Design an enzyme around this catalytic site. Sequence first.
Site, PDB file in Angstrom:
ATOM      1  N   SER A  44      -5.058   9.708  -6.123  1.00  0.00           N
ATOM      2  CA  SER A  44      -6.103  10.508  -6.748  1.00  0.00           C
ATOM      3  C   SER A  44      -5.668  11.852  -7.340  1.00  0.00           C
ATOM      4  O   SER A  44      -6.448  12.458  -7.974  1.00  0.00           O
ATOM      5  CB  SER A  44      -7.253  10.770  -5.733  1.00  0.00           C
ATOM      6  OG  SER A  44      -8.033   9.590  -5.575  1.00  0.00           O
ATOM      7  N   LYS A  47      -6.359  12.433 -10.894  1.00  0.00           N
ATOM      8  CA  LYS A  47      -7.672  12.822 -11.423  1.00  0.00           C
ATOM      9  C   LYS A  47      -7.592  14.200 -12.119  1.00  0.00           C
ATOM     10  O   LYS A  47      -8.414  14.500 -12.958  1.00  0.00           O
ATOM     11  CB  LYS A  47      -8.715  12.768 -10.311  1.00  0.00           C
ATOM     12  CG  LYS A  47      -8.980  11.408  -9.807  1.00  0.00           C
ATOM     13  CD  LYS A  47      -9.791  11.477  -8.535  1.00  0.00           C
ATOM     14  CE  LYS A  47     -10.510  10.218  -8.174  1.00  0.00           C
ATOM     15  NZ  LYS A  47      -9.638   9.132  -7.851  1.00  0.00           N
ATOM     16  N   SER A 104     -13.212  13.112  -4.884  1.00  0.00           N
ATOM     17  CA  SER A 104     -12.329  12.006  -5.183  1.00  0.00           C
ATOM     18  C   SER A 104     -13.005  10.682  -5.489  1.00  0.00           C
ATOM     19  O   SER A 104     -12.599   9.648  -5.055  1.00  0.00           O
ATOM     20  CB  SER A 104     -11.309  11.829  -4.046  1.00  0.00           C
ATOM     21  OG  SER A 104     -10.050  11.339  -4.626  1.00  0.00           O
ATOM     22  N   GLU A 140      -8.790   2.904 -11.349  1.00  0.00           N
ATOM     23  CA  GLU A 140      -9.121   2.743  -9.933  1.00  0.00           C
ATOM     24  C   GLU A 140      -9.787   1.353  -9.732  1.00  0.00           C
ATOM     25  O   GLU A 140     -10.634   0.937 -10.540  1.00  0.00           O
ATOM     26  CB  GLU A 140     -10.148   3.817  -9.546  1.00  0.00           C
ATOM     27  CG  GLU A 140      -9.610   5.247  -9.444  1.00  0.00           C
ATOM     28  CD  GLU A 140      -8.661   5.424  -8.216  1.00  0.00           C
ATOM     29  OE1 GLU A 140      -8.071   6.540  -8.024  1.00  0.00           O
ATOM     30  OE2 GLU A 140      -8.431   4.450  -7.418  1.00  0.00           O
ATOM     31  N   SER A 211      -4.567   9.790  -1.739  1.00  0.00           N
ATOM     32  CA  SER A 211      -4.322   8.926  -0.627  1.00  0.00           C
ATOM     33  C   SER A 211      -4.281   7.499  -1.141  1.00  0.00           C
ATOM     34  O   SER A 211      -4.994   7.167  -2.142  1.00  0.00           O
ATOM     35  CB  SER A 211      -5.400   9.118   0.431  1.00  0.00           C
ATOM     36  OG  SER A 211      -6.576   8.570  -0.067  1.00  0.00           O
TER      37      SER A 211
END
Length: 262
Positions: A44, A47, A104, A140, A211
């Site tokens: 993440s 992002k 997230s 994702e 993560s």
Amino acid sequence: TSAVQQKLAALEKSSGGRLGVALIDTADNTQVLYRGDERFPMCSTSKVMAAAAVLKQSETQKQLLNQPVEIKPADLVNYNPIAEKHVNGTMTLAELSAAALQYSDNTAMNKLIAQLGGPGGVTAFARAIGDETFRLDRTEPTLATAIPGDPRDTTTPRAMAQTLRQLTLGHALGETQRAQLVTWLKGNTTGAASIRAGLPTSWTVGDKTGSGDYGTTNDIAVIWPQGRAPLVLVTYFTQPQQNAESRRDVLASAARIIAEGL
């Protein structure tokens, strides 16, 4: 091998995994690197690039953050803490960016990727601001598969620290955009156990965590100590076991080591 690097290496050895660190000390433009050119899965932390890219779009499309975006049932992926609240409704691109960065939210990240024309559009923004290393290849949730040795959706600690610096302290964005990006990163809700946990409590921090599989545990931060010039710190960590547990403590400890090593 500096004192700081000896302590990072010992941390890494104690941890069972693989640790990547880059510090940029903006006062001296000094850097400390540990595995600083190895690739690490971003998860993440990517992002930040996607949200920055959208902010770059908003420098010409001025109401772009205000644009409603429908959230459909079929948009939902593996981790949608904000976006499941708005299914069969809409969220704006600023809402989506906040959700991505501060919680997230993966559905939110996917909307950002879509707005940029796919993962290639995120990579395209990295190349447009000077970063030849970052690469985003997937959406994702598959971008976080963190498979050992897979180059997809990776960066280096050196590259990401330079990028984060350029985005939050160095004019890659318009000043309205940059301050948006800082507000968002300062408001992150998911970082208390990571870099923040290793730093003096008087220091102001903006961060984005990540993560993934392989116990991948990451954080990238812009750091403003009171009294001295800011720092950028990137900490990446990954492990040999696919189902390894998260180790945010490693990131905290890495940050404490850098902070005590200044």
